[PDB]
């Protein structure tokens, strides 16, 4: 799909992995 919704998928990839990794 267009590269702002695909691109908004990196919000819930990065910031969710921040809770994961810093642990």
Q: Is 18 in the site for RNA (CB under 7 A)?
A: no
Q: Is 10 in the site for RNA (CB under 7 A)?
A: yes
Rounded distance, CA 5 to CA 3, Å? Answer: 6
Token pair listed for 1: 């799909």
Q: How far is the CB of 14 from RNA (least distance, A)?
A: 7
What single-letter DSSP state applies at residue 6? Answer: T
Phi/psi of residue 2, nearest 5 degrees: -60, 145
Which of 10, 23 has the CB closer to RNA? Answer: 10
Residues in touch with RNA (CB under 7 A): 3, 6-8, 10-11, 13, 17
């Amino acid at each position: 799909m267009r590269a702002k919704w695909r691109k908004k998928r990196t919000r819930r990839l990065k910031r969710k992995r921040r809770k994961v990794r810093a642990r």
